[PDB]
Structure formats: C-alpha cells, structure tokens
A paper describes a structure:
To explore the structural basis of the inhibitory mechanism of PITCOIN1–PITCOIN3, we determined the structures of PI3KC2αcore in complex with inhibitors at maximal resolutions ranging from 2.5 to 2.9 Å. PITCOINs adopt nearly identical positions in the ATP-binding site. Their pteridinone scaffold occupies the adenine-binding pocket, while the two vicinal (R1 and R2) arms that extend outward from the pteridinone moiety display specific interactions with the N-lobe of the kinase domain and cause the inhibitors to adopt a propeller-shaped conformation. The pteridinone scaffold of PITCOIN1–PITCOIN3 forms a single hydrogen bond with the backbone of V1187 located in the kinase hinge region and embeds into hydrophobic surfaces provided by M1136 and L1186 at the top, M1257 and I1267 at the bottom, and F1172 on the inside of the adenine-binding pocket. PITCOIN2 and PITCOIN3 are distinguished from PITCOIN1 by the presence of bulky hydroxyphenyl (that is, PITCOIN2) or N-phenylmethanesulfonamide (that is, PITCOIN3) substituents on the 4′ position of the thiazole group. The space demand of these polar and bulky groups leads to additional hydrophobic interaction between P1188 within the kinase hinge and the phenyl group on the R1 arm of PITCOIN2 and PITCOIN3. As a result of these alterations, the mild off-target activity of PITCOIN1 against PI3KC2γ is lost in PITCOIN2 and PITCOIN3. Interestingly, the terminal hydroxyphenyl and N-phenylmethanesulfonamide groups cause the respective phenyl moiety to adopt different orientations upon complex formation of PITCOIN2 and PITCOIN3 with PI3KC2α. The hydroxyphenyl group of PITCOIN2 faces inward and is stabilized through interaction with the solvent, whereas the N-phenylmethanesulfonamide group of PITCOIN3 forms hydrophobic interactions with E1131. While PITCOIN1 was found to be a moderate PI3KC2γ and PI3KC2β inhibitor with IC50 values of about 1 µM or above, PITCOIN2 exhibited selectivity against PI3KC2γ but showed micromolar activity on PI3KC2β.
Numbering used by the authors: 3 to 41, 49 to 158, 292 to 388, 402 to 432, 450 to 477, 480 to 894, 905 to 1006
The structure:
C-alpha cells in the first residue's frame, strides 16, 4: 500500500508537471527574481550595451521597473517606437536576479537595502537573450518521468472495536540487550494532535528465548472505541520503552494511520520501522475480515444560512469581544461554547474561522456534515490567518485543503520568508500526497527562489528520526520536478558546503600556529573545486563564485572558530562575495530569530514605519553548520568600548567617537545617530517581544553607518531588565548628555512599533507554534508561546500598552533614568 501511495504521488506530480510547460517563460524563467516587499527619488546607474559609461539618472522610487527600463531606453534612443521595450530587463550588477517589471523600484529589497546603507544603486539593462537561464527546465525535463531517488463495509456501519496485537520488535542491538532487561510499548490513539483516549500500556517482556534480536509480546490491545467512532485522520502511536537492569527510557516511536491513502481501514499484518540512529522492525497485526472497511465522509448538508434573530442582548457585544480577540490562545470554555452557537453570526468576520473551528465540541462523524456545510459557504481567509488551519490541532482533510485554497492567494515573495513553517506543517499531513505538498511543489515549479529555499529546508528536515522518510520522498519529488539544470547547480552548492565544512572542522582541530597554515592547505581542495566549477552562493544563489580569494580568507577568533570565506564574483560588474561559515552550532535557532525580526520589519514597513533594521541572512546547510551573511564595517560594542578605553575620556563617548570617526561631518554624525535611534528602537521591541536575553556587548553589533543589530541568539524565548540602555547609547540618541526631543522620538518609535506588532499577535503565535515540531531547545510547548503572548499584552489598549513599554524603557535606563521626565 505504501508503494501504491508513492506511485499515486508520482503520477499526480506528473499531472502537476504538465501544468508547468518549459515553454512558458513566467513559470520557467531560468533565473532568480529579485525579491519585492510592499511598502521620494534615488539615483540609479544602468549599464547599457555599446556605452562605455553607465547612464546615471534620478528615478522616482514609486515608478515601476517597466517605465524605468523605458527611461534608460529613452536616454540612448530618442524615439522608442523603433526599439522593442519588450525583451528588455534590468538586473542587479553582480547578481543573477531580474527586477520585476510590474513592481515599484522602491518595493525591491535590493533598492531598500542600498537606500539604508547609502550604497550606490547599480543595475544593468539587457535583453532576455543575454540573461543567464542555465537553471531553466528543458523539453527533456518535461518529458522525463518522476523518480523519488471483495465486499466493502462502510466505516460508519462498522461496529467492531479498534483492536490489534502488538506482535514483536525484530533486530534489537547488542547494547540494548546489555542495558535493559524488559521492554514495553505505550499505545496512544490521537486525532488533531490530541489523544482520543488515555494510552494503553503493553506488558513488560524480555528478549524471546534463543532470539536475542527479537522482543515478542504477541499481545492483543483493545481500545474503548468502535471503528465507526474513528475520524479519518486517526493515528496510532507506539512508543517503545526499556527498563534498566543495573527509570524507563524511551527507545523510539512509531505512527500508523488507521486509514490508508484510499480510506481503507488498515487490516492484517503491518510492519513499521523504528530508527535508533539502525532499523528495528515492529509488527502490528490488525484484524483481517473477509471484507474491506472503507471510510465514507458524511452526506452533504446544503443550506444558505442571513435571516436569523439578532436579539443582541449584550450577547452581540460579547461575540465581537471574542471575534476581535487576539488569538484562539487561552480562549475560555464558556467563550468556546457560545462562539460555537453563534458561529453563523460570524460569517461577516472571516479570519475568526480558526477560533470557531477550535471551539467545535467534537469531530464526531455526525457533526461533520454541519461543520463542512459551514466551511463551504465561508468567505475566503487571509493567507496569513489560514496558516493556523495547517497546524496540528486541525487534521481534517477538508479544513486543511480549503486552508490551502485560501493560501493560494499569497505572493511568492511573501511565501518565501514563510517557507520553514510550511515545511514543518508537512508533518501534520498523514498522507504523502496532499494539497499542501502539491501547493509547495507547484510554487517551487514557478519560482526558482522558492525551489532553492525548499531544497535547503528539506535537507534539514531529513534529520528527523520520525519524519525522515516522508521528507525524503518530498525532496525527491522536488529535485525530480526541478529539472536537470537546477539539480546540477544544487549539487555544486552541496559539494561546496561539504568542502567548506571539512575545512572548518580541520581549522578547529588544529591549534595555534598550525591553525593558520592548515587553512591555506585545506582551502586548496576548494580551489580545485572552483577550477572545475562555477558555483552559486547558497546564502544568495544570485551570486556566482568563479574562484576563491585565498589571501582574504581567514578565521574569526571565537568559541567556535568561524571561517571568513572571500570569493571573487563571476561577474566583473559585481563585488566580491564575503560569507561566514560556522560549524559546531545549531543555526536553526538563529534562523528563527532572524526570521521573526524580519517579519516584524515587514509589518512595520506595511504601516509605513521604517526603523532601518539590518536584515541579514543565515542558512543551515547541514546539521549544526552553515553560512551566515557578513555585515560590512561593523563591530561589537565590546570592541568599540575597549578601543575607546585606550583613551578613556568619558564613559558616554565610546559609541559617539566611533560613529564620529566613520561619520566626521556634523550632518553625517546626525544621519548616523538618527540611524542608531531608529534601529535601536526596533531592536528594543524585538528583544522584549521575542524574549531575547543575555544581550551582552558581544551580542550587540553596530554598523559604521550607525545601525544597531543582534548576532547571537542563544537566549531565545527565555524567561527572566527587558532590554538595557547604557549611558553612551542614550548619548547617541540625545546627541548630548542632557535629554532632547530625539529621545522622545525614540520613545514614540518604540511604542508605535510595539503596538504594530501587537496587532499581528495571532500571526506571530502561529509562526512560533508551527516551528514547535522542528525541535529547538526553547520551543517545545505552547507555554513557550504563552510567554510571547504575555509579552504582547493583547487585552490592553494601545494607550496603556504605550505606558507599559515606556516604563520598560525607564527600567532599561536604570541608574541614569534619574535624568529623564517620562
Ligand atoms: O566586518 C565585519 C564584522 S564581523 C561579524 N559580522 C557579522 N555579521 C552578521 C552576522 N554575524 C557576524 C559576525 O559574527 N561577525 C564576527 C564578529 C566576531 C569577531 C570575532 C570574534 C567573535 C565575533 N564582517 C565583514 N563583512 C565583510 C563584507 C564585506 C563586503 C561585503 C559584505 O557583504 C561583507 C567582510 S568582513
């Protein structure tokens, strides 16, 4: 049946492939699209063929890339009628990414970065023919097949009790036989991620006589449930325990779906695989009658429910209070029961559907008809709201598929920064083929960035003990449907990272003197690689490295010695590529913190608030290793303070003098100090809301332009000053020892941004919830989310929330807070 599920998946993906022909350029562009985030004049320089100097001109940020292309065309051509405006595109110099014509110049992320750093905006005008499209799919790609490397009784008429005999575990290890004397299983039955009944424990039995590799229970297990009472998505969990010989110690876990991908109840012997990480086979024998049991969903209920009593005796106000509540998190039982009665009065508010669904009394087969009738007349949800319908608490195929149908309204650009949570949501689909995985694969088909990011996220997801096989099939489908070009580039990137990681290991394994000469020798391997391959940068695949710059490659001195890898651009119009490669730390936590910060930045920009945040990249390439973006011309606060100490003129001047050294002009220092004010406000809000703690001087970094950012996120969602404002940071903000209206601006910015994040409390809780199953040390349960919820204070109004955050700023000032009038 599993092989049949794989085959059905493959053939469905063949269908999906037909939906994306290689001829269609917008689905198959062959190149990365320059990212856009929706949100004056700036100077752009555009290189044009046949001109020795690029044309530099002032463009409106609001103007679209299409008309900017035409403006450059107008520079070189006095009449644009003869030339074709079509078949002309703009790329970033040095980066193999194409600006999107319909979108505004200001909306492009590269433009926004250059504006913040005051970097020269450098573009190239070229035809589609000149653009590198080596990633594009071929006719060979479209034609190739997909490779990932009798009577019937309806279930509602099925009286039999769910039962099965746990037979045996086969292939147990020597050290297992050494360490434990008996074994037993805990059997749980669940739906929507919750137990339907209390778990039943097997008897404790030792290894079978004459068969040490075998544990034989041969034990029947009967649940107090009836086949007709089992939801379609019912899952049986079997956890193995060993008792030590000298508490019980968990050895592994298995899951079995109670109905297969064709809705047939599992019957007969089914084998399951427990990975010690070594494969143990577990045998579960299910009843096998002379007939097949099929699940049949209930009969459709059709109603137009509109024209009902609106007594509204304070009850409408109670309903709106529940509707306009922040999230489903913590919703009272009584509130649940009456949101469920008055669910048909909430159609006017679509994004409250999860709450309603979370307040269903049960998912018994009978009530399913009315639930589905409501779902199919429900208004479309915001994609972001619809995420919640893909978490574990909603297993129902109808709910989830219709959530994905609402989700299909999301842009690729917005989707890309959300990909990790989707990769995780795959875990709550019990079948291989599902609307969610098809949605992800189709989005990857049409967008090279989506495909690339999915690839790396699936490679991390593989290391899951329980879900590794599912992710292996998903990754195989992705690599198969991506095409030959995409695949070979991904293989080059995989080889590059593996080589870099080897170099990292060797650098830490050597000591002192040796460590500097081993780096040059280890790197010769890499340079051989570059001799035979041009390879795209895994952190930003728009950058192509032709060759390693050995002499600029070094190592940072830290607990884990990171590698400063400098490579030369394949494009002479580009800059040299600088990344850090770190091994020995789980970068997935850092990535989550960075993603949360970035999403706050997006939320702020959506309401027009620009806190000038440094948004840098981090990629977990393999287990406990990866590439991190390097921010140029920036230091930790430690370093600034110690360098200043050599002079030691004042505790309040170290940040000021540093910024003044890199910004000598009075206008320049004011510009850099304003950058500090805004970025500091953003960092303070992000620190308090994410529970970022241990913000020591090393953790804080400051850019020469004046922007403040965070680098190490070891304390994430930690519990207990919320943030710390030292005297020299107050000096930069005020511009003087005494307080100025610039500090009031700082406070205003903090409180404004804080309230903007509170408005999106549901989004943030959902994103962290969906990362729960990924297995980071500080995000294991819903209480970890309750910390963030409490930090966001949803019940309070914006006014009292401002009061609260302002008191936080005073506590952060601490001893020097005497000098301020709130
Ligand atoms: O100057 C710098 C600042 S060091 C730095 N920065 C980071 N940034 C983001 C994330 N983590 C870090 C980071 O951990 N550290 C190390 C800080 C540390 C040092 C020594 C011991 C312990 C800790 N970085 C560089 N940038 C470039 C460059 C040039 C041109 C373009 C470009 O994109 C980058 C070359 S070197």
């Amino acid at each position: 049946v599993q092989n049949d599920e794989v085959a059905a998946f493959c053939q469905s993906i063949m269908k999906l492939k037909t939906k994306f022909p290689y001829t269609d350029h917008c689905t198959n562009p062959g190149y990365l699209l320059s990212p856009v985030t929706v949100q004056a004049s700036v100077k752009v320089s555009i290189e044009i063929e046949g001109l020795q100097l690029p044309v530099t001109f002032t463009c409106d940020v609001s103007s679209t890339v299409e008309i900017i292309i035409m403006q450059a065309l107008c520079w070189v051509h006095d009449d644009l009628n003869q030339v074709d405006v079509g078949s002309y595109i703009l790329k970033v110099c040095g980066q193999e990414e194409v600006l999107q014509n319909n979108h505004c110049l200001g909306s492009h992320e590269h433009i926004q970065n250059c504006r913040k750093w005051d970097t020269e905006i450098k573009l190239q005008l070229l035809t589609l023919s000149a653009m590198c499209q080596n990633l594009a799919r071929t006719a060979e790609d479209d034609e190739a097949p997909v490779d990932l490397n009798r009577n019937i009784k309806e279930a509602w008429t099925a009286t039999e009790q769910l039962q099965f005999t746990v037979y045996a575990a086969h292939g147990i290890s020597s050290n297992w036989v050494s360490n434990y004397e008996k074994y037993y299983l805990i059997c749980s039955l669940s739906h929507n991620g919750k137990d339907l009944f209390k778990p039943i424990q097997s008897k404790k039995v030792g290894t079978y006589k004459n068969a040490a590799y075998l544990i034989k229970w041969d034990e029947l297990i009967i649940f107090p449930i009836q086949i007709s009472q089992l939801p379609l998505e019912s899952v049986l969990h079997l956890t193995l325990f060993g008792v030590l010989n000298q508490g019980p110690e968990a050895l592994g876990k298995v899951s079995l779906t109670l109905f297969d991908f064709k809705r047939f109840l599992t019957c007969g012997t089914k084998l399951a695989y427990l990975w010690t990480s070594e494969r143990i086979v577990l045998q579960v024998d299910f009843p096998s009658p002379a007939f097949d049991i099929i699940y049949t969903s209930p009969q459709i209920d059709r109603n137009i429910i509109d024209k009902l009593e609106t007594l509204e005796s304070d009850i409408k106000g109670k309903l709106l209070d529940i509707i306009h509540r922040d999230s489903s998190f913590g919703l009272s039982k009584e509130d649940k029961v009456f949101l469920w009665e008055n669910r048909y009065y909430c159609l006017k508010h679509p994004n409250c559907l999860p709450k309603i669904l979370a307040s269903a009394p049960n998912w018994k087969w009978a009530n399913l008809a009315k639930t589905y009738s409501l779902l199919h007349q429900w208004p479309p949800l915001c994609p972001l709201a619809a995420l919640e319908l893909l978490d574990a608490k909603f297993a129902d195929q109808e709910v989830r598929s219709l959530a994905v149908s609402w989700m299909e309204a999301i842009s690729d650009d917005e989707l890309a920064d959300l990909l990790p949570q989707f990769v995780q949501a795959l875990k709550y689909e019990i079948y291989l083929n599902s609307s969610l995985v098809r949605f992800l694969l189709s989005r990857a088909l049409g967008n090279i960035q989506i495909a690339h990011s999915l690839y790396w996220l699936l490679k991390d997801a593989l290391h899951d003990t329980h879900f590794g096989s599912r992710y292996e099939h998903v990754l195989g489908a992705l690599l198969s449907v991506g095409g030959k070009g995409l695949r070979e580039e991904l293989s080059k990137q995989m080889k590059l990272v593996q080589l870099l990681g080897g170099v990292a290991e060797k650098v830490r394994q050597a000591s002192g003197s040796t460590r500097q000469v081993v780096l040059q020798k280890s790197m010769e391997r890499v340079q051989s690689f570059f001799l035979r391959n041009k390879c795209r940068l895994p952190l930003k695949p728009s950058l192509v490295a032709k060759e390693l710059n050995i002499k600029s490659c070094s190592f940072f001195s830290s607990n884990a010695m990171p590698l400063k890898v400098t490579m030369v651009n394949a494009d002479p119009l580009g800059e040299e590529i600088n990344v850090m490669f770190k091994v020995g730390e789980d970068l997935r936590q850092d990535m989550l913190a960075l993603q949360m910060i970035k999403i706050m930045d997006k939320i702020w920009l959506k309401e027009g608030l620009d806190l000038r945040m440094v948004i840098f990249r981090c990629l977990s390439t393999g287990r406990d290793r990866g590439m991190v973006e390097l921010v140029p011309a920036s230091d930790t606060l430690r370093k600034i303070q110690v360098e200043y100490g050599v002079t030691g003129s004042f505790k309040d001047k170290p940040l000021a003098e540093w910024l003044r050294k890199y910004n000598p002009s009075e206008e320049e220092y004011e510009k850099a100090s304003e950058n500090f004010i805004y970025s500091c406000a953003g960092c303070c809000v992000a620190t308090y809301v994410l529970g970022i703690c241990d913000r020591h001087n090393d953790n804080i970094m400051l850019r020469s332009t004046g922007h403040m950012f965070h680098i190490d996120f070891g304390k994430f969602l930690g519990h207990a000053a919320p943030f710390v404002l030292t005297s020299d940071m107050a000096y930069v903000i005020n511009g003087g020892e005494k307080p100025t209206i610039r500090f009031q601006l700082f406070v205003d910015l903090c409180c404004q941004a804080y309230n903007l994040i509170r408005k999106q409390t549901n989004l943030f809780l959902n994103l962290l919830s969906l990362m729960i199953p990924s297995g980071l040390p500080e995000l294991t349960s819903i209480q970890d989310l309750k910390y963030v919820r409490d930090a966001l204070q949803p019940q309070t109004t914006d006014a009292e929330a401002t009061i609260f955050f302002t008191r936080l700023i005073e506590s952060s000032l601490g001893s020097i807070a005497t000098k301020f009038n709130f």
